[PDB]
Amino acid sequence: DLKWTERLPECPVYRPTKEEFEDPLTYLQKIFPEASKYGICKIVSPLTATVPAGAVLMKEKSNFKFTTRVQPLRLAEWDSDDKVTFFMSGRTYTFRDYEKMANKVFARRYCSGGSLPDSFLEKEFWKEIACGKTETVEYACDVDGSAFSSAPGDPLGSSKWNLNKVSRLPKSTLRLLETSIPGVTEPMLYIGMLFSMFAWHVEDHYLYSINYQHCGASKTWYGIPGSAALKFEKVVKECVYNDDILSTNGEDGAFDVLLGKTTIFPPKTLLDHNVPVYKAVQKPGEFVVTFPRAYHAGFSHGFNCGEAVNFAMGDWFPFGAIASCRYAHLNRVPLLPHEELICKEAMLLNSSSKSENLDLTPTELSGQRSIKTAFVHLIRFLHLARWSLMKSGLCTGLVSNTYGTIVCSLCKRDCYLAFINCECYSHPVCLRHDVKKLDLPCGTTHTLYLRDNIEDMEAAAMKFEKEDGVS
């Protein structure tokens, strides 16, 4: 029927002034207590680029080209083999040529290539999915490159809103990151065409996402509140159980695996089972932020170019925890060194300047509280694990741990404070495992690798645990 599209509630739109703009993390700090509730929000940039994105790509960068990927929008269920073969059949284009091709296919569909009204193209996307005869769209996802100008004059490029600068911003908890991560530490370019889509995802680590549209047609996002995440996944399986918008129906998967086989489904089904959905229609010059654990999907209305990066502030730390456990439960190597980030942030808060942590926003305060809580819980657990270990008498060696984060060979959880190493060095395990029941081919001698400064961190934990709101 598609009337639901017209009556979807829109997400909050903020239009700060230049003086309000500051940097995106402080701004998100300020607006968090309301936008948080929606999972998705939109910020109109009060700063214009002096050099537009096509010009920055053509002149500031040399021979910029990119390869595309082919998505099947909606068709008799595509099996994994057929899927994988055509995902990267896509040809390599030049910005100008991808634009030209997309606008030709758009003209072909609607006799003219002029942008069309948003309600029209959205209804068209959902009806095309339901019964369209077109098979595929080309989308240049995940391109490494940036359309912000390196020019010093450019007000947007020289601002702290440039995606290139965000991960190293003072309130970016990933500023502490050791090594770069594509899309996480550094932005990526997304270049779309008519009906090129991004299906429902919760991101990596429930981390925040920030996306800026540089140019082109509108982009429609559907966002779910972090609050609704469980309900979201619940309904999906039920409705995949119902054979409503049915997938391949394997019925033996982790949740993203199931999502990765479904034809993208309309928000109406989500509204029918009473899970909140908000719409954002993103134009050039607008940032869309997705909040940690906020599910979102979306599609393009035509040729367009956007730029996105994932980030974290301290309020994200509880969500990170949840992701970690799921990562472990699904026995998957985590994206981020969670424990290391807890420790580094917490010991930066410990030994603070203290001339800073006085009058500050409630959301930052809550994030600091969440960092301290994560730190205190981690140190208490590791203390009792170490006590148990010592009394077992199965731990032969103790070694000052000088490494970065390592991955436990059984669960796959990140280990920063401590791990138990073996004889060959290929079966280290986190302290969550009963060492008596370790059956390792290398032997039985177990060596505890422990961070050198554990005493300082224990003192920090005992300081924090007496502090207000950290119980």
Binding site: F87, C141, D142, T179, P182, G183, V184, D204, N310
Partner: peptide, 8 residues
């Protein structure tokens, strides 16, 4: 490896 995600 360190990265974001999709099917190749």
């Amino acid at each position: 490896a360190a990265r974001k995600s999709a099917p190749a």
